[PDB]
Amino acid sequence: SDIHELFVPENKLDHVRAEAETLPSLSITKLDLQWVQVLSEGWATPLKGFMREKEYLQVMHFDTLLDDGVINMSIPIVLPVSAEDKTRLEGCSKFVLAHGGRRVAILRDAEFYEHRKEERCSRVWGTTCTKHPHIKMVMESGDWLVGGDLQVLEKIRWNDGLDQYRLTPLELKQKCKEMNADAVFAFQLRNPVHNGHALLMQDTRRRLLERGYKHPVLLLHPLGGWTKDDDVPLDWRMKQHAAVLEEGVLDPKSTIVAIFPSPMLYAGPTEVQWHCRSRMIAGANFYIVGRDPAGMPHPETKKDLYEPTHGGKVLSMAPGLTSVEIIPFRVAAYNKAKKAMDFYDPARHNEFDFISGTRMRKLAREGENPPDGFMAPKAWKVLTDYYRSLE
Amino acid sequence: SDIHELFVPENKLDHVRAEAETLPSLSITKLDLQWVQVLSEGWATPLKGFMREKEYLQVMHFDTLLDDGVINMSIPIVLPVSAEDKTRLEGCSKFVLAHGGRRVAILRDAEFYEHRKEERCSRVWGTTCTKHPHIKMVMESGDWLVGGDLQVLEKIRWNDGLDQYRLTPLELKQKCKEMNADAVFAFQLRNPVHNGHALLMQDTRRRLLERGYKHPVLLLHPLGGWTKDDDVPLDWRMKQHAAVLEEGVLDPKSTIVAIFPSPMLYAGPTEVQWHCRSRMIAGANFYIVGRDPAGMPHPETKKDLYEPTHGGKVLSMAPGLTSVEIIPFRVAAYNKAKKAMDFYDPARHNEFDFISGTRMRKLAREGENPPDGFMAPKAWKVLTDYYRSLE
Ligand SMILES: OC[C@H]1O[C@@H](O)[C@H](O)[C@@H](O)[C@@H]1O
Ligand SMILES: OC[C@H]1O[C@@H](O)[C@H](O)[C@@H](O)[C@@H]1O
């Protein structure tokens, strides 16, 4: 239940920042900096920094963290570095990480070890398909990894108008306490919210009320780190979600909308454990699985990279998630009879019309609306503005 | 710990055999039959048969078996089937497995699930390199897997003159008991034994005696399931090991020589867990790691597929191996100062000369002998007969 943040104390920051100007420095990428944000805020509690070699091995082979207890940790959080930089910095026991001209953190007692890229991609993604857009970034990175104790100077801000939504796990716990929450149920997502998603979240709220929880709180938690090129961008998704809440499709008085700062791997059942354990750190006792969670189509062939039931099955078997209950995904679809979203029943297959993201883009392209009741009208209007902005 | 064998009771065999002639049958390969042998003898205790879907997933993602407790199980033991055979047998709750005209086992309450071959190879081997000889067998197998409860009619014999060495875990425990063993230390291997290997085993015996064990027993345990084309064949290796024992380089009075019936995957750190946990089932309290354990050169390039320290590091971190102590590998080499083998010390680098398997084959090719003290003379003569037999 403890959260291990990695920030310098407030009262020491001005002095610490002043001194770090003298240390040798290592330039990191934007993706690396998003991982520094993830580490800094305690999402990967109790990691002390970028993973050392033994931590990396245990994650890759067992999906658990080096610890006297059992802690779920299924994805590597590692910092790739060039051979040149390894040569320069090995044996330096205290150096700075910098990005965009700013010194953002100090890495202490660093160790350098081989980045065996093909093995990492095979074991984490279950493929080494070079066209996968996140695998491509790993394959292009340096041949070494550096792990160590990380101390982060201050909260990583992006200054894009969305930092107000980038809450830390501690801040989310404080917000839930202010709402007198006695159940926190989380929904991970990377797409617009339609009324089938909403139906799932409303069904979960209803089920928790019937169990006797007095104040269940929905944590609507869109991912906002690196995503692939064909996802709707984060700022447009936040506008769309805001429209859903303003329409009352989800109730603002029992919902927290916040951005989860992690890069997305699109690693299917390996990554859904990460999506779950991070919401657990933020206090969620309940986790709603999505459709094809963390999945994507195999490039070139367009067939599903992962088997669509494996995320839920693996999450149900995973070690170190004892404090969270998995809420199964339930297919919803537009019911032509009720003119409304409803849970799908194969015993009534012919009543239901499915609407995918490609369908929505094609609908906007012809200036069409989806069926009435598929999406809150102001939220649909946000999406048509997005597609229009693509000209 | 209990061993869960899968054999039909003695008193029932003649009856069950007579009945199984009427059941629908599924033809399995030689490799499959070697896995039936592994399963039947309890090496994969407490597996009940070929892995069901949820067992398979937990193995691939977590290296542990579906459990009430935590049990190490890092490799899939699965039965591939063609789509035609799946169509024929799904819903059949009791059918036989057959090979070479013999009905060898009954599979009960079978379930069929997709063989996602690329994902299996990526997660288990950390590569999908097609040319890896065991990966090629997986890639060429059927598109379905079948799991279920397996009942094996009788001990799988190969009738090649080596069945006397293929002892079950129960038989190994009984043999150790007959020797009044109070420590059993196991050495996995797939190659000839030279006097560096022997030095490691003799040093381990010495250390166990100094800890106060009165009767430590060496389990010299060559693997004898499927191996790749360029390994010395099993019958030649057993002749070579017998020569080492007859020369007294290892003491027959405190050594058990037996054949471990598992196919070899050559999957490095994933497979060394399997090599260790199987010896644990047979009662080994101590497990000596070899050099580059379960490794092989990447085909085409010929560099090491795995990082040579990872097998020992991963084994030290693995869950479910609490009752085994890992004895670290120590490099030995031919010391030119004296002439015996000796543990390598970089501080005396120039005294030592290494002798690989390629070096031994080239030595035989020119009719040359290795240095005096590298290998027992009778055992070297076995190897020169082997190399000569390939003309
Ligand atoms: O998810 C945050 C951002 O990540 C970038 O990698 C994507 O290209 C953007 O569209 C997205 O808004
Ligand atoms: O290890 C048992 C046998 O397996 C076969 O696959 C190899 O080709 C033989 O050389 C070996 O003796």
Curated annotation (Swiss-Prot), chains A, B:
Keywords linked to the UniProt accession: ATP-binding, Disease variant, Dwarfism, Kinase, Multifunctional enzyme, Nucleotide-binding, Nucleotidyltransferase, Transferase
Protein name per UniProt: Bifunctional 3'-phosphoadenosine 5'-phosphosulfate synthase 2
First-tier enzyme category under EC: transferase
Protein's UniProt keywords contain Transferase: yes
Span covered, complete protein: 223 to 612 of 614
Enzyme Commission designation: 2.7.7.4, 2.7.1.25
Ranges where the record places region Sulfate adenylyltransferase: 3-391
Protein's pathway: Sulfur metabolism; sulfate assimilation
